[PDB]
Amino acid sequence: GSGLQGHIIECVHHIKRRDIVLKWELGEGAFGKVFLAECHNLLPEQDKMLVAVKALKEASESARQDFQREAELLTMLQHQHIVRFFGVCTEGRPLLMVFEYMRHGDLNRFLRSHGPDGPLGLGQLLAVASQVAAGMVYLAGLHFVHRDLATRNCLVGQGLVVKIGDFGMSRDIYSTDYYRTMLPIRWMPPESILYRKFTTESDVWSFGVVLWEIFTYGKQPWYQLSNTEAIDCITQGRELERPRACPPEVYAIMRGCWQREPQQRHSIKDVHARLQALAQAPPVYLDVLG
C-alpha cells in the first residue's frame, strides 16, 4: 500500500556488498531492518560517508520484482526536499537499498525532542513546514500520490534540512498511527476513510494535518480520541483546533487543506507559496499571548 507501489501501477546504480560496512541498526519492521552504514566509493572526495541501508527480509521472485520497480522510481525522484537514493545491492539476500543518512532522524521524533516536552521557534517551524511543502510540490508535479504523508515519514538532516522519505517501516515503528489493511486514519480526509481512494487532494489534506503536527511539536492528531472516535470526527466534519504555537495566518492555511470537498482544497503549489512567504517574513505572533 506504499505510494511508490501506487505510482508504479497507476539505470539503477548498483553498489558492491563489500563497499557497505554496517555500523548499527536504526530500526526494524516486518519487512526487514534499517542500518546506519559507511559506504565507500560512492561520493567524490568522501572515501567514507554515512548512509541509511534498508534491508529486505524476503528474497522471493515477486518481492525482487517489486524491489526493482521501487528502485527504478526512487532513482527518478530527484529533489532538494526528497531523501537521496544512492542505489541497490542485489548480491543475494537481503536485498539492499542505500539512502543518505539523515542525522536528526524522523521529523516526528525531531519535533517531540525539540519541543516543550531548547524548543524550536516560529521561524524554524515555518522553515520545516515550507520544506515539507516543497517536497510535496515536486511529487504533485509528477502526479505522485504519497498516501502516507505525516511527520514520521519525513527525515531531518544537518542544518534543519527537512526532506520527504521513509524506510518503509512506519506501520511497525509507529503502529499506533494506523488502524486496521493498516490505514493512517488520523491523517486521512473523509473520502479516503470511506472509499479508500488516495489522490493529490487527499495528500493536501494530510499536509494540513502535518502542519498541525509541526505546530503541536509532533502530537498525534485527535490524541484524546480512539481510532473509531477519530473516524467519526473526520467523517462528521469536525476540525482539529488551532495549536497554541500556530499563528492565525498558518491556521487559515491548514483550514484551506481541510475543505470537505477535495475540489475545494488549495493546491499544494499555492500552500507552498503561502508558507514560503511566511518563512521569509514570519508574522509577529507570540504563542504565550495566544
Ligand SMILES: NC(=O)c1cc(NC(=O)c2cc(-c3cccc(N)n3)ccc2Cl)n(-c2ccccc2)n1
Ligand atoms: N508502507 C510501506 O510499505 C511503505 C511506504 C514506503 N514509502 C514510500 O512509498 C515512499 C518513499 C519515498 C522516498 C523517497 C526517497 C527516499 C526515501 N527514503 N523514501 C517517498 C514517498 C513515498 Cl510514498 N515504503 C518504501 C518502500 C521502499 C523503499 C522505501 C520506502 N514502504
Ligand SMILES: O=c1[nH]cnc2scc(-c3ccc(F)cc3)c12
Ligand atoms: O544496532 C545495535 N543495537 C544495539 N546493540 C547492538 S550491538 C551491535 C549492533 C549492530 C551493529 C551493526 C549492525 F549492522 C547492526 C547492529 C547493535
